[PDB]
Design a protein around this ligand. Structure first.
Ligand SMILES: CCCCCCCCCCCCCCCCCC(=O)OC[C@H](COP(=O)([O-])OCC(O)COP(=O)([O-])OC[C@@H](COC(=O)CCCCCCCCCCCCCCCCC)OC(=O)CCCCCCCCCCCCCCCCC)OC(=O)CCCCCCCCCCCCCCCCC
Ligand SMILES: CCCCCCCCCCCCCCCCCC(=O)OC[C@H](COP(=O)([O-])OCC(O)COP(=O)([O-])OC[C@@H](COC(=O)CCCCCCCCCCCCCCCCC)OC(=O)CCCCCCCCCCCCCCCCC)OC(=O)CCCCCCCCCCCCCCCCC
Ligand SMILES: CCCCCCCCCCCCCCCCCC(=O)O[C@@H](COC(=O)CCCCCCCCCCCCCCC)COP(=O)(O)OCC[N+](C)(C)C
Ligand SMILES: CCCCCCCCCCCCCCCCCC(=O)O[C@@H](COC(=O)CCCCCCCCCCCCCCC)COP(=O)(O)OCC[N+](C)(C)C
Ligand SMILES: CCCCCCCCCCCCCCCCCC(=O)O[C@@H](COC(=O)CCCCCCCCCCCCCCC)COP(=O)(O)OC[C@H](O)CO
Ligand SMILES: CCCCCCCCCCCCCCCCCCCC(=O)O[C@H](COC(=O)CCCCCCCCCCCCCC)COP(=O)(O)OCCN
Ligand SMILES: CCCCCCCCCCCCCCCCCCCC(=O)O[C@H](COC(=O)CCCCCCCCCCCCCC)COP(=O)(O)OCCN
Ligand SMILES: CCCCCCCCCCCCCCCCCC(=O)OC[C@H](COP(=O)(O)O)OC(=O)CCCCCCCCCCCCCCCCC
Ligand SMILES: CCCCCCCCCCCC(=O)SCCNC(=O)CCNC(=O)[C@H](O)C(C)(C)COP(=O)(O)O
Lengths: 37, 443, 253, 84, 62, 157, 83, 387
């Protein structure tokens, strides 16, 4: 339940925040070892 | 010329901007490629279509480097100036901006040069830039970079003594006097075939493309597919056909069998590919084989149809690379087995994928349909069977295209969410160009 | 008590020692050696004018020392990695030994940013690490690569923060795992941002500037009055060494 | 482990055998120099010098002072990285 | 131990800090001469012997 | 996740006994994942013990000639003798070691310290004179008090 | 994914050690013998420049096929005590 | 009348005064000798005639003297310059022998003198091997000169004995397979003498070849040996000093292809571009410019090395030297791989350049930054310039 924007815009990185930020790598696939091989 | 100096000097000022001003760096590098698009559109406005074949000439004394505009160069220059700001939208560092700015200078000056030594100097000055672009340290591939650089260097080194042979033979490398003098056409013809059969992927010197066009980033793939392959075609149309035409007749069975086996064997290889970017990368070899045979037919309106196929490929295949790049950027894989049901999760991206799939298979209302019809008119007029070979093998292209689309788009919905505004506007100019050039291309 | 004269200094004994209360202007150097321990730094380093870098310190590449920060290499060695940022008034020190038995030098990897008022002493910080503000990393502790320490955190001596995670608290506990994009790009982004700010400061610096003109005017006034003393410092150092040797010889026998 | 634990053992027994104050059958692969074999310090130094002569080493005074058994000598030779 | 260690450290830091500008400039010239003398092919090494701490000619070597 | 132990440096510590060329035993502490040559450098051994890894793109790595007992032979990392890394090791054996080679001879950068190395005893092997360039060579005699750790850079040029 | 190194570590490392347990010779002998060979016998090729090109090309390929490489060279004669 | 020989008397008087001034300066304990170096440069300018090649050698040696610091090294370089200058004016084998032997003795002594640190014995070893290999080549030159002198009765350089004199000249250029003395020298001797050895004697000897030499033979097998051996050796040797030694053997093979097909204009253009690149290579402190040397030694198009290679290729194709040209093109394709290795090593790496501490802050940035502007010389190179 992260908060990456202030109420007036203004993106926040959340570097030290507890909640996991949604970002570019959020939908990266979980690699199957045999498929990778 | 003065305008070109001003555009180069404005483009080179990206390095002097302090890096802490991020917005200014982005805006400056994007505008530095927007301006040449306006200038080339103005050059199209200035062109007299009922006038001379070569217009807007400039020659820089005794330094070679002479320039002029014809129709093929003008269409290719317009396509390059469209493609470069889209590449600017896909980069994030000043090193990338500067590499693509230097590449744009070299491509634009190479497309309209009228000197063979000038063409040699301008084109393969991009070799080290391509090496650094493909073999970038964390996410590139040094093997692919070595392959593309070594194949291009091998071809260029075959050409260079024959270039100097005709230069000692007549006294100039200017194409207007090289076409009017008596020269030993077999030697120079073999040198020119050696460069342009590597630039255009023609078997057997084609193995660099599957590695390089996949290991490149999305901007590099857009540039390499949509632009740099067509320098071989404009090499054929500008330098080799006017200067060594006796060779160009005598080599026709060999060039013909190279084109036929490249088309068939590359189409057969595309069916067994399991990487989406490798699927898109192989399909370009068959299209360039059709381009080369249409150029070499010299039969009805061969320059027109072959240039139109070069433009149609340069519009359609960068968009497929853009869609694969979106999937890779937001899912971190290019492997078909990880993707299914993309219609339910990316409806806009899948619709764009379907439309560009249909365009790549030369269906009507796309410029590839008009292109392939006119290319086969040019091929048919020499003999009917050389056209029949391309006609009967259309099931083989549609097999891989629809198999890749059906495997990644339908099924169980898994994969990333739909496209953003930025991704949609990277795709969008290619779609508008395709709709126009496939419905009302001429007036 | 320890005397403040050193006859085995590399450049000899100090001929004239000035009491600090007799100084009429601030003479604090920013980079200076301690006997035979000289700092090492590159051509494109940013050292702030009120920062102190002394002793056995190695600085690499595009690293920066911001305003009021101290890097004191007097008990051991300190190494600052390529494009690593020491922000405002953070302290880096080093002990002579650590309880783990390893090397006690403070080693900071490349692309490491250290937020304001943090203290590093005889610790190991691996590449791509964000140390938060008001944080202390104690003697012999290890911070592993691609990890983040939250502000106002204590890492006790001989403790470890595992790689790829965010830790925080006093004492530091597990908060969450970093995302893959955070490890891939964000740490390098923070280091690059602070390097860009340091470059902005470096472009505008006029060194040595013009503050010496007043001090030179005072010295010119002293030469005018005939009160400026010319001291042969090399010869005085030589004579002081000879007297020290004679005094040492005239007590053993 | 730089060398095997059998051939070094029989070589140790071979050089222990030629001592006039030792018994040629009382020598065991795991014994003591003081309680079992009945040797003072100089006899221990002489035996360690014989072992050094056979294996081609140099054992310092403290290391040879720590050696008090046949097993200790075998373990010291086996742990030595410069053995022959 | 910590108190004694900082007494020993404050001695060295006070020694370095309380040098005048003229002494510091003379020491920089001495450091320069010493680095020029670190070349073993320097042509003065065959005639003169130099003092280590001040880079002055101490005696004739030959 | 629960009340389990806070991570300490002592959990990742590896101790190796090293015998230098004078026969003096040394206690060398390292961390898991660190190579052996790095732990030897950070212990404070002289610079005459170390030499460049003679591969392409890896001459900035320092390496040492170590003697490894038979129990720890299988914990040295595997190198294909047909690959380019194999030719790098062959060049190092050909040029640096020569007739100091034994059946226990390895190179210390090819040993990655883990829990299986805990308590392993190694010895430093002798090497022949060598030169990389004018600023990095070895005349053949180990008479120098300069540590390798005190060098600020490893220069290939 | 990373590929596995083929073979066994002990056997591979014994293959890496092989034929290098020997003091390397100085290069003065090779250089002096090369200079003697060129200064004494390279005049034998003076008329070869006028020979037919098929002969010259086959001779160049023959020299390439019979060339032995100086780097990583070893003989079994280095470690035997009799011929 | 001796009025046509005032430059020779000026040379001798200047040497006599310079030795005495250097003695007086050393009696004061001066640890630096920039005044001696300036007087040496003035003496270099004052003894050089008004030809293009003579002044090219003079300006090159004036630039080279800024990397040498002792009085004896400056004296040895001046007396090597006397041999280098007067070999270009030699019209016999007497003066040829004396100039070559003076140069060899000066190089040997400088290799002994300037070594420092752990690399001292390696440099002395390589200097001894070079001296022994040079002695027998000098003996071959004397022996076949005596044969020619007995046969012809005069000092004309004609006949069959010129083949061995040609082999002497090929030894002095490090032509493979007599190349290994230079390979030995590159691995141990310091960078300033390596900079001196790759530029000045090649210019002096090629100018003698252009001015006063004819032979009735060929050098084609040595072209093949140099190009193939240099390219394959630089591909296979991981140490950078050996890489640059083998790439130098490849470049001297290209210069020999320019000599063999006549057309010395392409020879002079490529040699000048190579010498400027060498002046950049051995004085580099920022390692990013090591990539510019790489792209300009690989013959990549917009930089000046392309033009230097490409007129050699053009003149070879003009006189139809097809087989040697094909071998040159194959070795050019091979050379790109290790120049790309150079670019991988020093361009795609984080930048670290240490500051100076004892003064002299990055003391040769002027020359290196001036020589990097070989990207602006190609505008003048494309014209009919060097002829
Ligand atoms: C009398 C007194 C006796 C004294 C004897 C002196 C010997 C001293 C030892 C020595 O010289 O050390 C070796 C020494 C080694 O050189 P180096 O300086 O240490 O290193 C340089 C290189 O790194 C070399 O490195 P390397 O040796 O470690 O090996 C690396 C390897 C690495 O190799 C590679 O990796 C590259 C290979 C490329 C392709 C690989 C094949 C892949 C193909 C795919 C498979 C398909 C099948 C195809 C089958 C084959 C088709 C190609 O390189 C090679 O093998 C290639 C080198 C060959 C040089 C060829 C140049 C000769 C002239 C050019 C024309 C011929 C060239 C062939 C082309 C023409 C073909 C039509 O060699 C030399 O110096 C050469 C001179 C020695 C030869 C002649 C000796 C003179 C004695 C004369 C005898 C009596 C007089 C009669 C003749 C008249 C006067 C000439
Ligand atoms: C009658 C003949 C008179 C003497 C002619 C030959 C002696 C030339 C020696 C010379 O210029 O001494 C440098 C000397 C500067 O040395 P420095 O400032 O004591 O040393 C500072 C460091 O080297 C660091 O400073 P830097 O490395 O930036 O400067 C080194 C120096 C020169 O640095 C270089 O060697 C690089 C310059 C590259 C340009 C080469 C020109 C060749 C172009 C060929 C065109 C045909 O800088 C210059 O460019 C000074 C040129 C002054 C006029 C030269 C005539 O220039 C002068 O003091 C003026 C000499 C001019 C005649 C008096
Ligand atoms: C060899 C002939 C050149 C033909 C190449 C194929 C061009 C592809 C598209 C076909 C469009 C046909 C346009 C016909 C009228 C335009 C003007 C014209 O006459 O064409 C010019 C040149 O035409 C062009 O340059 C056409 C530009 C086409 C390139 C379009 C792709 C770039 C757009 C990308 C998408 C942009 C979307 C942006 C919106 C968001 C000259 O050709 P010719 O008539 O053959 O010349 C006469 C010969 N002579 C002087 C000797 C008598
Ligand atoms: C830098 C100073 C030295 C540059 C010398 C270059 C010689 C040739 C080397 C190989 C060709 C490389 C060309 C790449 C150009 C594009 C590029 O990436 O530009 C650079 C900078 O390139 C330039 O120097 C641009 C200016 C020169 C070209 C334009 C002006 C003349 C036309 C951008 O900065 P970064 O890559 O972040 O720089 C970091 C450096 N490093 C890779 C070592 C970590
Ligand atoms: C080394 C320098 C870098 C590489 C060489 C670059 C050479 C200059 C580029 C090509 C110059 C010719 C442009 C094409 C053309 O038709 O130009 C004419 C028309 O001028 C234009 O409209 C030029 C448009 C320039 C831009 C269009 C693309 C061409 C090349 C782009 C280079 C810059 C791209 C910047 C990208 C960031 C000439 O006009 P003029 O008045 O000089 O000639 C008329 C008469 O003969 C008098 O001489
Ligand atoms: C700015 C550079 C960086 C600063 C550092 C300076 C470095 C030191 C000085 C340069 C060293 C390199 C010079 C190498 C020698 C080249 C010149 C040799 C002479 C030559 O080429 O022949 C003459 C042409 O001159 C010409 O005009 C030749 C044109 C120039 C050739 C060099 C090309 C690369 C630049 C023709 O001689 P002739 O016909 O008059 O002779 C007939 C009477 N015997
Ligand atoms: C090598 C680079 C080229 C790569 C492809 C070479 C393919 C072989 C050439 C086929 C040419 C056609 C042909 O056979 O005609 C020849 C024409 O002669 C000719 O004129 C022969 C010219 C062929 C080579 C030209 C290529 C040079 C490219 C640059 C090379 C580098 C510099 C030069 C070493 C002789 O006909 P025939 O004997 O079969 O007729 C039988 C009745 N008499
Ligand atoms: C960009 C490249 C700029 C290089 C400048 C080339 C200038 C050539 C001048 C030659 C000349 O006028 O001859 C003077 C003169 C011959 O004419 P004279 O004065 O009548 O004897 O000879 C020289 O002084 C030659 C100078 C050569 C400089 C080194 C070679 C190029 C670097
Ligand atoms: C080339 C030949 C020249 C040789 C000349 C050198 C000869 C030097 C001989 C003179 C040196 C001495 O006797 S030194 C005098 C030695 N005697 C003492 O010290 C009194 C105490 N007794 C002991 O120490 C005994 O050795 C013992 C009870 C066995 C202790 O048992 P451990 O041993 O277990 O300890």
């Amino acid at each position: 339940e992260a908060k990456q924007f202030t109420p007036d815009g203004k993106y926040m990185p959340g570097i030290f925040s507890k909640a996991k930020p949604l970002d570019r790598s959020t939908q990266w696939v979980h690699k199957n070892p045999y498929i990778e091989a | 010329m003065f305008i070109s100096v001003l555009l180069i000097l404005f483009a080179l000022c990206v390095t002097l901007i302090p890096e802490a001003h991020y917005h200014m760096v982005r805006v400056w590098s994007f505008v530095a490629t927007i301006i040449p698009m306006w200038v080339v559109t103005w050059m199209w406005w200035n062109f007299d279509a009922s006038g001379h074949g070569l217009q807007m000439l400039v020659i820089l004394g005794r330094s070679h480097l002479a320039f002029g505009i014809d129709g093929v160069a003008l269409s290719l220059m317009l396509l390059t100036t469209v493609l470069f700001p889209i590449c600017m939208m896909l980069l994030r560092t000043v090193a990338g901006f500067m590499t693509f700015i230097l590449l744009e200078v070299l491509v634009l000056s190479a497309l309209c040069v009228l000197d063979l030594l000038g063409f040699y100097i301008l084109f393969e000055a991009s070799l080290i830039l391509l090496f650094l672009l493909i073999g970038r340290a964390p996410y590139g591939s040094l093997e692919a970079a070595y392959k593309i650089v070594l194949y291009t260097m091998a071809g260029s080194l075959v050409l260079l003594p024959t270039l100097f042979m005709i230069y000692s033979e007549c006294g100039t490398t200017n194409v207007l006097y090289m076409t009017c003098a008596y020269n030993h056409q077999t030697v120079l013809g073999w040198g020119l075939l050696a460069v342009l059969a590597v630039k255009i992927p023609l078997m057997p010197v084609h193995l660099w493309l599957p590695e390089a066009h996949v290991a490149a980033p999305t901007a590099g793939s857009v540039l390499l597919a949509g632009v740099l392959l067509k320098l071989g075609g404009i090499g054929f149309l500008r330098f080799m056909l006017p200067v060594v035409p006796e060779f160009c007749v005598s080599v026709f069975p060999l060039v013909s069998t190279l084109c036929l086996v490249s088309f068939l064997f590359s189409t057969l290889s595309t069916l067994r590919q399991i990487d989406l970017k490798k699927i898109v990368a192989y399909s370009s070899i068959a299209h360039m084989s059709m381009v080369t045979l249409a150029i070499f037919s010299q039969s009805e309106f061969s320059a027109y149809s072959s240039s139109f196929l070069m433009i149609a490929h340069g519009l359609i295949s960068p968009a497929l690379f853009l869609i694969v790049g979106i999937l890779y950027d937001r899912a971190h894989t290019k492997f078909i087995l990880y993707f299914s049901g993309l219609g339910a999760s990316m409806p806009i991206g899948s619709t764009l994928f379907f439309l560009f799939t249909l365009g790549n298979l030369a269906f009507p209302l796309f410029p590839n349909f008009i292109a392939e019809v006119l290319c086969m008119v040019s091929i048919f007029a020499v003999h009917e069977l050389l056209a029949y070979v391309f006609c009967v093998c259309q099931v083989l292209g549609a097999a891989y295209g629809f198999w890749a689309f059906n495997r990644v788009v339908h099924g169980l919905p898994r994969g990333p969410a739909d496209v953003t505004r930025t991704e949609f506007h990277t795709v969008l100019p290619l779609l508008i160009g395709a709709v126009w050039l496939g419905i009302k291309p001429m007036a | 008590g320890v005397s403040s004269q050193f006859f085995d200094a590399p450049n000899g004994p100090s001929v004239k020692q000035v009491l600090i209360e007799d100084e009429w202007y601030n003479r604090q150097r920013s980079i200076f050696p301690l006997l035979d321990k000289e700092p090492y730094y590159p051509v494109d380093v940013f050292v702030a004018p009120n920062a102190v870098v002394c002793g056995d310190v190695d600085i690499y590449g595009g690293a920066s020392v911001f305003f009021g920060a101290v890097l004191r290499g007097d008990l051991n060695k300190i190494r600052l990695g390529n494009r690593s940022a020491i922000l405002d008034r953070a302290v880096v020190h080093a002990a002579r030994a650590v309880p783990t038995g390893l090397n006690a030098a403070t080693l900071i990897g490349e692309k490491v940013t250290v937020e304001p008022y943090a203290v590093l002493r005889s610790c190991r910080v691996e590449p791509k690490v964000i140390i938060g503000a008001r944080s202390v990393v104690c003697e012999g502790a290890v911070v592993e690569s691609e990890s983040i320490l939250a502000p106002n955190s204590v890492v006790p001596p001989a403790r470890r923060i595992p790689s790829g995670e965010l830790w925080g608290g006093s004492p530091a506990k597990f908060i969450r795992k970093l995302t893959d994009h955070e490890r891939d790009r964000v740490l390098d982004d923070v280091s690059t941002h602070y390097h860009n700010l340091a470059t902005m400061f470096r472009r505008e610096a006029l060194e040595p500037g013009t503050a010496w003109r007043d001090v030179e005017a005072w010295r010119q006034k002293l030469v005018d009055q005939g009160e400026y003393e010319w001291i042969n410092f090399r010869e005085q150092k030589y004579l002081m060494r000879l007297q020290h040797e004679a005094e040492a010889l005239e007590k053993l026998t | 482990g730089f060398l095997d634990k059998d051939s070094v053992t029989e070589r140790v027994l071979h050089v222990t055998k030629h001592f006039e104050k030792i018994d040629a059958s009382k020598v065991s692969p795991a014994a003591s120099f003081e309680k079992d074999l009945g040797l003072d310090s100089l006899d221990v130094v002489e035996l360690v010098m014989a072992l050094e002569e056979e294996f081609g080493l140099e054992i310092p005074d403290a290391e040879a002072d720590k050696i008090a058994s046949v097993g200790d000598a075998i373990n010291y030779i086996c742990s030595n990285p410069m053995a022959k | 131990k910590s108190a004694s260690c900082y007494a020993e450290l404050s001695a060295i830091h006070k020694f370095e800090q309380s040098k005048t500008f003229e002494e510091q400039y003379t020491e920089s010239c001495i450091i320069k001469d010493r680095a020029a003398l670190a070349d073993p092919s320097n042509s003065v090494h065959q005639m003169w012997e130099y003092d280590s701490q001040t880079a002055l000619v101490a005696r004739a070597k030959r | 996740h629960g009340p389990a132990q806070t991570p300490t440096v002592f959990d990742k510590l590896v101790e190796v006994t090293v015998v230098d060329m004078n026969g003096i035993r040394h206690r060398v502490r390292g961390l898991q994942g660190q190579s052996l040559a790095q732990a030897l450098v950070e212990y404070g051994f002289p610079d005459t013990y170390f030499f460049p890894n003679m591969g392409f793109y890896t001459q900035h790595i320092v390496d040492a000639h170590v003697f490894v007992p038979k129990e720890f032979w299988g914990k040295v990392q595997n190198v294909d003798p047909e690959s380019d890394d194999g030719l790098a090791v062959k060049r190092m054996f050909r040029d640096i070691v020569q007739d100091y080679q034994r059946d226990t001879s390895f190179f210390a950068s090819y040993i990655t310290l883990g829990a299986e190395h805990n308590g392993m005893t190694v010895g430093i092997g002798p090497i022949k004179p060598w030169i990389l360039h004018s600023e990095w060579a070895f005349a053949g005699v180990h008479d120098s008090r300069n540590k390798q750790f005190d060098k600020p850079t490893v220069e290939i040029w | 994914y990373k590929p596995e190194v083929p073979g066994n570590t002990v056997d591979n490392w014994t293959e890496l050690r092989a034929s290098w347990n020997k003091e390397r010779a100085s290069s003065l002998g090779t250089n002096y013998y090369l200079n003697v060979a060129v200064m004494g016998f390279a005049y034998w090729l003076n008329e070869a420049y006028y020979f037919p090109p098929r002969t010259l090309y086959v001779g160049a390929l023959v020299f390439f096929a019979l060339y032995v490489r100086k780097a990583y060279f070893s003989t079994p004669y280095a470690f035997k005590h009799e011929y | 009348a001796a009025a046509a020989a005032m430059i020779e008397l000026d040379l001798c008087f200047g040497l006599l005064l310079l030795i005495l001034f250097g003695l007086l300066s050393l009696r004061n304990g001066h640890v630096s000798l920039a005044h001696i170096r300036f007087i040496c440069q003035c003496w270099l300018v004052m003894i050089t005639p008004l030809e293009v090649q003579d002044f090219a050698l003079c300006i090159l040696t004036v630039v080279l003297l800024q990397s040498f610091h002792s009085f004896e090294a400056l004296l040895f370089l001046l007396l090597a310059y006397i041999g280098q200058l007067y070999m270009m004016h030699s019209c016999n084998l007497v003066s040829f022998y004396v100039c070559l032997e003076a140069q060899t003795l000066c190089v040997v002594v400088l290799c002994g003198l300037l070594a420092r640190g752990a690399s001292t014995s390696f440099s002395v070893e390589a200097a001894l091997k070079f001296l022994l290999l040079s002695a027998m080549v000098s003996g071959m030159a004397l022996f076949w000169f005596s044969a020619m002198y007995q046969r012809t009765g005069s000092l004309d350089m004609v006949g069959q004995e010129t083949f061995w004199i040609l082999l002497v000249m090929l030894f002095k250029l490090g032509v493979a397979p007599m190349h290994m003395w230079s390979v030995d020298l590159y691995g141990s001797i310091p960078k300033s003498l390596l900079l001196y050895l790759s530029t000045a004697p090649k210019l002096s000897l090629f100018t003698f070849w252009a001015s006063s030499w004819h032979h009735d033979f060929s050098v084609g097998v040595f072209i093949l040996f140099s190009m193939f051996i240099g390219s394959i050796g630089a591909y296979g040797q991981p140490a950078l000093r050996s890489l640059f030694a083998y790439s130098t053997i490849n470049e001297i093979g290209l210069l020999l292809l320019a000599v063999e097909t006549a057309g010395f204009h392409t020879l002079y253009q490529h040699l000048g571009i190579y010498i400027i690149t060498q002046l950049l290579l051995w004085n580099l402190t920022d390692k990013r410019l090591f990539a510019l040397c790489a792209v300009s030694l690989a013959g990549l198009p917009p930089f000046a090395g392309f033009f230097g290679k490409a007129w050699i290729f053009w003149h070879a194709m003009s006189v139809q030297a097809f087989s040697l040209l094909a071998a040159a093109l194959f070795c050019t394709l091979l050379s790109l791989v290790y120049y790309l290795r150079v670019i991988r090593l020093f361009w795609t790496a984080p930048v670290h350049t240490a500051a100076s501490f004892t003064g002299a802050p990055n003391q040769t940035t002027l020359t290196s930054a001036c020589a990097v502007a070989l990207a602006f010389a190609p505008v003048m190179l494309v014209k009919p310039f060097v002829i």
